[PDB]
Amino acid sequence: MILKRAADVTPQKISTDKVRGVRKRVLIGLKDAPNFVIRLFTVEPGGLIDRHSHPWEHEIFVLKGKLTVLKEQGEETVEEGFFIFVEPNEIHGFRNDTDSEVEFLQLIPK
Amino acid sequence: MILKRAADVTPQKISTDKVRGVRKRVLIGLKDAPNVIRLFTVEPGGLIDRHSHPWEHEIFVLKGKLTVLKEQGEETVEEGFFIFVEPNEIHGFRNDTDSEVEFLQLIP
Secondary structure, three states: OEEEEHHHOOOEEEOOOOEEEEEEEEEEOOOOOOOEEEEEEEEEEEEEEEEEOOOOOEEEEEEEOEEEEEEOOEEEEEEOOEEEEEOOOOOEEEEOOOOOOEEEEEEEEO | OEEEEHHHOOOEEEOOOOEEEEEEEEEEOOOOOOOOEEEEEEEEEEEEEEEOOOOOEEEEEEEOEEEEEOOOOEEEEEOOEEEEEOOOOOEEEEOOOOOOEEEEEEOO
């Protein structure tokens, strides 16, 4: 078995035309042995993952804070302890409307 | 899109020869659309004895200090640790602290 401390994984500071104020930790990568990809996202205050869609599904678990979820036609806030299923091709995004860092797990089957 | 509070899932208590002091919340089940996610809560002194399954498991520790039973020895980890358990690998879990331990379990 493999046991690793998520905070030891090097964060990637993402700042693009689609994503701002986000740090990404790849806990289990595309080329890793498990049949899943797992990323830990940290969204800074005011951080924004623009609405987008992909053919693959997503599972989200909110670890810390209040996360605003952008949907195709609207939005919704959830807090730590919420889990989210995003269907294939479903338009979605994320925003941190608080003054604290927000953390969530992103789960993708291979 | 499905949005759910994990704690509102009604927990299942598990009391078998090899599991004691453990509750399980099935967040995503077989009948559900996603391609299985469970939230385990281990009471103080609770124990998931050494066992194996042919599928792999992924674990993410949400709360507390989780003692992992391995094929060779034990290892205690804390909130924020992630664990990959290989297919058919013998493993278990114990809570040696005085507060509840919580972890997510992911099965592809």
